[PDB]
């Protein structure tokens, strides 16, 4: 069915990919409507042990905030490639085990700094063990125009260098991977 991507989720995802340009990055979307976003890793994404730890932390953090893990985003390092590799499909498929309607979002991290006219994203849905792109009419945006401009202005203010993902948190566990300085509001 339809999925509404919130401003906060889209911005933090873009800020993640922009803090680590030219790297693959991934993350999770949460929903009670994709309302929030947990940036995951920017290196060695295909190793499973810290991903396992991250999935559990966000699950119980979500469960206490009345949220469920509802999606996964992934930006490929290859610049012409917006198609999900086996890692993206594996993780997204596992997430759909606990949430059948989960979405897999491929992010074009090449179309970020000049924010394009149309969202630089492909949204895929689970269709019996295969992931297939959603009809574009089924993907809705809470003020797409406003989400465009805030990413531009916040990147201009180097705000992405204050963005914390789980990799950063592992380096120093005092760092907040919920990014509670969501001063974008």
């Amino acid at each position: 069915g339809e999925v509404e991507i919130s401003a906060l989720a889209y911005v933090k995802m873009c800020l993640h990919a922009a803090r680590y340009p030219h790297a693959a990055v991934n993350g999770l979307f949460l929903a009670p409507c994709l309302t929030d976003c947990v940036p995951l890793f920017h290196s060695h994404l295909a190793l499973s042990v810290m991903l396992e730890v991250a999935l559990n932390q966000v699950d119980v953090w979500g469960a206490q905030a009345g949220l469920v893990v509802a999606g996964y985003y992934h930006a490929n390092a290859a610049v012409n490639d917006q198609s999900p590799g086996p890692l993206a499909l594996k993780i997204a498929g596992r997430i759909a085990e606990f949430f059948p309607d989960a979405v897999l979002i491929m992010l074009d991290n090449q179309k970020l700094v000049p924010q394009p006219r149309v969202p630089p994203v492909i949204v895929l849905e689970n269709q019996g063990l295969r992931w297939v792109p959603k009809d574009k009419n089924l993907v809705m945006w809470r003020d797409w125009e406003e989400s465009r401009q805030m990413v531009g202005a916040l990147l201009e203010d180097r705000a992405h260098q204050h963005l914390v993902d789980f990799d950063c948190h592992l380096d120093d566990i005092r760092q907040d991977w919920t990014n509670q300085r969501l001063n974008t509001q």
Binding site: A24, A46, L47, A77, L170, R174
Partner: protein, 271 residues
């Protein structure tokens, strides 16, 4: 010569600034209105402006600085570096590979150039070629530890965990007291999976932790490896009971890490 401008360019170079906007703004003003006065600093400033122009999207200015530098220092390694940077910024990846290839023909162990070729191959989606090229290099320069680490990471990206584990064994054998290589070796063996790999992973996570008691990745890995071992039916009751002990030891160490972290973070927010 406006001293305010020439000295600002000095401290920006010395402090490795990232303010490409201001560096282009002052530097371009210096090239066009005060070149007669810059004296000895002219060529560094030309190079400084070119780099910042590339990142700020002033390719007209970058090309001018590049052409002038090429004229003053023909054949130089540093102009080649700038030429390669420009090709990369324009996504002229093939031209970039050609440039980095003849640097490495003059210096097979050049680390910067090899590192640039690897980034380009990832941008190109040619990780497989990158793996073949790193292998050819390591057959002739087996002592290059950083190149072994680059290859390890390439194999992980390609999900070839046994080959990555092999590369990390070279790094552990040459750096037996480096906690990071033990920790990454353990993550790779954990990902390969199975009880035997999981027992191995627990042990190297324990070695990384003993090598550096503050490696959070090692602590979590020890907990996660030990907990899976303790729930695996194949394991002995001796191995299971021993790993249940490892896991709630790890769990309480994890429990304590977050409290010390959380108390430290509140002394930080209270200035």
């Amino acid at each position: 010569t406006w001293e305010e401008m020439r000295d600002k360019m000095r401290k920006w170079r010395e402090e490795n600034s990232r303010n490409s906007e201001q560096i282009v703004e002052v530097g371009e003003e210096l090239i066009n209105e005060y070149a007669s006065k810059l004296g000895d600093d002219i060529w560094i400033i030309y190079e400084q402006v070119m780099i910042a122009a590339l990142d700020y999207g002033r390719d007209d200015l970058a090309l001018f600085c590049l052409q002038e530098l090429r004229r003053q220092f023909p054949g130089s390694h540093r102009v080649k570096r700038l030429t390669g940077m420009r090709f990369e910024a324009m996504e002229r990846y093939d031209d970039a590979i050609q440039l980095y290839d003849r640097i490495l023909q003059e210096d097979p162990t050049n680390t910067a150039a090899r590192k640039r070729k690897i980034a380009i191959r990832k941008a190109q989606g040619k990780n497989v070629e990158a793996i073949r090229e790193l292998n050819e290099y390591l057959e002739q320069f087996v002592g290059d530890q950083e190149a072994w680490h680059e290859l390890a990471e390439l194999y992980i990206n390609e999900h070839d965990y046994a080959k990555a584990a092999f590369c990390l064994e070279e790094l552990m054998m040459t750096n037996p007291h480096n906690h990071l290589y033990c920790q990454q070796y353990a993550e790779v063996k954990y990902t390969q999976g199975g009880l035997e790999n999981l027992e191995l992973s627990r042990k190297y996570f324990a070695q990384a932790l003993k090598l550096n008691n503050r490696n959070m990745r090692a602590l979590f890995g020890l907990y996660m490896s030990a907990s899976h071992i303790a729930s695996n039916p194949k394991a002995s009751a001796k191995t299971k009971k021993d790993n249940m002990k490892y896991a709630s030891w790890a769990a309480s160490q994890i429990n304590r890490a977050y409290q010390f972290a959380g108390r430290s973070a509140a002394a930080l927010e209270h200035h």
